[PDB]
Amino acid sequence: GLGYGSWEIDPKDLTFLKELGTGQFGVVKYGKWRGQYDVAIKMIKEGSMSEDEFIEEAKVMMNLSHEKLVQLYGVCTKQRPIFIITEYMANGCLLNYLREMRHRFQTQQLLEMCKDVCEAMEYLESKQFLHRDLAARNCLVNDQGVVKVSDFGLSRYVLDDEYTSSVGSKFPVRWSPPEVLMYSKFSSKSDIWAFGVLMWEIYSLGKMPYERFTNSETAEHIAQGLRLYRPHLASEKVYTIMYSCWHEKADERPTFKILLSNILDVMDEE
Numbered sequence: 001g002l003g004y005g006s007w008e009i010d011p012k013d014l015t016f017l018k019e020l021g022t023g024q025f026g027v028v029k030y031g032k033w034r035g036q037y038d039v040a041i042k043m044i045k046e047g048s049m050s051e052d053e054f055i056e057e058a059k060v061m062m063n064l065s066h067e068k069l070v071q072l073y074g075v076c077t078k079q080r081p082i083f084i085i086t087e088y089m090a091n092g093c094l095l096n097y098l099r100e101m102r103h104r105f106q107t108q109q110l111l112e113m114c115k116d117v118c119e120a121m122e123y124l125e126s127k128q129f130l131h132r133d134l135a136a137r138n139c140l141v142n143d144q145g146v147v148k149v150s151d152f153g154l155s156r157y158v159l160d161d162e163y164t165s166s167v168g169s170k171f172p173v174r175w176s177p178p179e180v181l182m183y184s185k186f187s188s189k190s191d192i193w194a195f196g197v198l199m200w201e202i203y204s205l206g207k208m209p210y211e212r213f214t215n216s217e218t219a220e221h222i223a224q225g226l227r228l229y230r231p232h233l234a235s236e237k238v239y240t241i242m243y244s245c246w247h248e249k250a251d252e253r254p255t256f257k258i259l260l261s262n263i264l265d266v267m268d269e270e
């Protein structure tokens with residue numbers, strides 16, 4: 001209506017129903033939009049985000065739409081704190097979901113989670129949009145068990161320097177390729193590397209990558225050409241796919257289109 005652009009949600013249209021917890025940007029709630037539609041609401045804690053830059057980018061993100069990508073519905077910007085409104089993912093983040101042993105996953109289900117994420121990443125790649133921080137902690141699970149990619153691109157607007165450079169105590173070292181750690185060279189191939197680590201997290205049921213190492217030791221391990229190794233639940237064919245994401249030379253890593261074909265082949269063969 002009057003006063004709200006196409007990227008802007010009227011917060012008065014929101015009904016807050018349940019607090020989901022607190023993340024890095026702040027509190028996340030479950031609610032309804034105009035009484036009928038499930039939504040997630042992330043309340044951006046003040047001082048945490050580059051808000052004017054994020055809002056301009058939110059206008060571009062409104063045009064990103066894919067079955068396996070968490071849908072941005074809009075932002076609430078007239079106020080502090082601002083809200084990010086999205087489709088609701090009832091089973092929470094993939095990381096905690098993988099760690100609940102009660103699910104007793106079949107490997108067929110684990111590969112489907114990889115395929116879910118890979119389709120979303122191929123879509124983002126087809127739009128020349130880097131995620132820049134892909135990890136199981138960022139993927140979400142809906143009430144049907146479908147995995148979708150979330151938080152895409154948001155690291156660009158984080159003001160806490162501990163998060164934004166490899167020198168920082170909160171940088172995702174364990175998801176980063178050597179050229180990121182050594183030179184800060186981000187590209188589609190640093191998303192590819194992180195996807196390989198995500199595949200490892202999935203088949204490891206949510207273990208920390210390099211769980212016996214510090215970040216500093218992980219960087220040295222990776223820099224010397226050493227890698228994660230095969231999770232007990234990964235077949236040889238599955239391990240070949242995730243390992244292909246970790247070529248020291250970025251240009252020898254596959255695209256998300258090639259990974260998708262490889263994953264579909266293994267689904268057929270297994």
Ligand SMILES: *CCC(=O)N[C@H]1CCC[C@H]1NC(=O)c1sc2nccc3c2c1NC(=O)N3c1cnc(CC(C)C)cc1C
Pocket residue numbers: 020021022023027028040041042061070071072084085086087088089090091092093094095096136137138140150151152154
């Ligand atoms: C393992 C990670 C974890 O523990 N997360 C916790 C942070 C607060 C409580 C936990 N979060 C959630 O359970 C959920 S459920 C859900 N559904 C939809 C969206 C989200 C969501 C969360 N947390 C979220 O942060 N989001 C969310 C993600 N990404 C964006 C950005 C846009 C462009 C997609 C927005 C939201 C609301």
